[PDB]
Every structure is written in C-alpha cells, then in structure tokens.
From a paper:
Rspo (R-spondin, also roof plate-specific spondin) proteins are evolutionarily conserved from fish to humans and have well-documented roles in a broad range of developmental and physiological processes resulting from enhancement of canonical and non-canonical Wnt signalling. ZNRF3/RNF43 specifically targets these Wnt receptors for ubiquitination and turnover, hence reducing Wnt signalling responses. Direct extracellular interaction with Rspo proteins inhibits ZNRF3/RNF43 activity. Here we report a molecular level analysis of the ZNRF3/RNF43 ectodomain structure and its interactions with Rspo proteins.
The ZNRF3ecto crystal structures revealed a distinctive variant of the protease-associated domain topology. Two β-sheets (comprising β2, β1, β7, β3 and β4, β5, β6 strands, respectively) splay apart, accommodating an α-helix (αC) at the open edge; two additional α-helices (αA and αB) pack against the β4, β5 and β6 face of this distorted β-sandwich. A disulphide bridge, conserved across species, links two structurally elaborate loops, β3–β4 and β4–αA. The crystal structures for apo xZNRF3ecto, zZNRF3ecto and mZNRF3ecto showed no major differences in the main chain conformation. Comparisons of ZNRF3ecto structures for proteins crystallized in several different crystal lattices, or for crystals containing multiple copies in the asymmetric unit, consistently highlighted an acidic region (N105-E114; residue numbering is for mouse sequences unless otherwise stated) within the β3–β4 loop, the short αC–β7 loop and the extended β1–β2 hairpin as flexible elements of the fold. Our crystallographic data provided independent structures for multiple copies of the ZNRF3 ectodomain in eight different crystal forms. All but two of these crystal structures reveal an extensive interface (average interface area 992±109 Å2) formed between two ZNRF3ecto polypeptide chains. This dimer is conserved, and pairwise structural superpositions yielded r.m.s.d. values of <1.3 Å (for 275 equivalent Cα pairs). The interaction is twofold symmetric; strands β3 and β7 of the ‘subunits’ abut face-to-face at the core of the dimer. Intriguingly, these structural features interact in a parallel (cis) fashion consistent with ZNRF3 associating as a dimer on the cell surface.
Residue numbers in the entry:
A (entry chain A): 54 to 104, 110 to 204
B (entry chain B): 54 to 104, 112 to 204
C-alpha cells in the first residue's frame, strides 16, 4: 500500500501564530512495518548511526542508504536499523533506498515479525524531494498517511 | 468517521531505549475539521486561554458548562482554529460537560479546518483526562 508523505516547514511570528509550507511525496509501506499513519519531527540518522545519545520520543527517522558495496559487514541489516530506530523512540522510519534497492526485499523479508510502527521506503524523485529539504531546511515535521 | 486515540506514556532507559505504555480510547471526528490522522505531544489548554508552543502539538481542551462561561470569547469552533493557528497539529475537546458543543462544531461543517478536530465524552474522556491531568508528558496518536 502507498504512503503519502508530507514534509512541513514552519515559522512562528512574534505573536505566536505559525506559518507552514507543505511538500508532498509518495513512498511505500514496508511489510516489515505496520501500515499505520504517523507524524513527528524529523531526525536524519546516518546508517552508521544505527548500531544516551538520546532524542525526544516520537521522531521520524529519515535515512539515506549507502551503495551496498560500500558496506561489507553492516552492524545491522536495514531491518534491524529500523527496529533500532524504533527502540530509540522513532514514531516511524523512512529509508531512501535509491542507492540500495535490494533493501526493499530485505525489509519485506521481515513481515513475519513486523514492527508496530511504520517503515516506509522512498526512491527516485520522491526521495530527491525529501532529502533536499531534510538537508537544506532547518527543522521539519513529517506526516505519513493511509 | 470515528476516531481512535492512543495516549502514549514513555520512559527512556539507562541504555537510551524507550519503553512505552499505550492507553486507547475512541472519540469522533467533527465535520468542522479534516478527517485525518495526527500525532503530537499533548498540551492541555484551558478554554479561556484560547482567546509559546512547539509546532505540532495536540491540544487537549476540556469544555465546561455553558451556564458557567456565559460571555465566551470564541465559539468552541473558534477555539480550535485559534489552536491550530498556534501550531496545534490536531485539537481534542472533552465535551462531557458541554454536549451542545458537538452541534456548534458539526455546524462549521461546510467550511472546515485543515487539521483534525475530535470530541470525546463519557468514559473515553475520563481516561484521557485522567492521564493528561497527572502532569506527565504524553504523546497522542489519532487514527482514522
């Protein structure tokens, strides 16, 4: 099932009223994860960063995968990476699998013991759109639907 | 459209790992707001108080007898937009003591809010409020 992702940028005024800019994206839910919506602030984690460096409960991990031959022995599989994130309070995880499309099977290999939070992958222009904000922008919220 | 609400309590671990306790309850979407899911930290707002906050919160607002606030600053529908104006990702109203608020909300039906407005009552607001009241930090997940 397809996942609609929204990345929201926001400025307060001095008065306290907020002003937001939404960008829409389409990815897919992994069967490694629940098929629920989730929303929460974005944390960019390196894949080397998933093996008390704590973050507030309910963040949305955005993770750009590496060429797979640039990682002979991963500390964890991409499955275990998402599972780690969750243990550390990730409300959801989003992988950019543009460099590592084998990863989709690896995720969907874990459908026997799925996580109660959503694991979403994105490729192509929808990943491009995502990472371009996550990199440039200060600080963002993500909403994942349906 | 009925709304399923999970309230989440959580504790980090010596190892930086979280442990959660989730309490579920059922409420309803108002046609005055969008029928979408939403998640966010809970901020308890006092009704007088919607006439300072991190973007993406979920407002929990307990209404009171309309006999006791008889010069209201905004309609209850107004209070919700105000909350959204102030970064609320969704608003939850406990309408146990002002049941005619259902009516006001679902009357804004024709011109709605981008975010969800949900009303709860009875044993479901009792659960929600019995957590929110005991000043912990909590997360709210609202599900369509």
């Amino acid at each position: 099932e397809t996942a609609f992702v929204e990345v929201v940028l926001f400025e307060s005024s001095p008065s306290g009223d907020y002003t937001t800019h939404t960008t829409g994206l389409t990815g897919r839910f992994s069967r490694a994860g629940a098929m629920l919506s989730a929303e929460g602030e974005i944390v960019q984690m390196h894949p080397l960063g998933l093996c008390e460096d704590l973050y507030e409960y309910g963040w949305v991990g955005v993770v750009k995968l590496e060429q797979p031959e640039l990682d002979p022995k991963p500390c964890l599989t991409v499955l275990g990476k998402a599972k780690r994130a969750v243990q550390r309070g990730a409300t959801a995880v989003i992988f950019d699998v543009s460099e590592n499309p084998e990863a989709i099977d690896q995720l969907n290999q874990g459908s026997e013991d799925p996580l109660k939070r959503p694991v979403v992958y994105v490729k192509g222009a929808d990943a491009i759109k995502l990472m371009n904000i996550v990199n440039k922008q200060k600080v963002a919220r993500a909403r994942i639907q349906h």
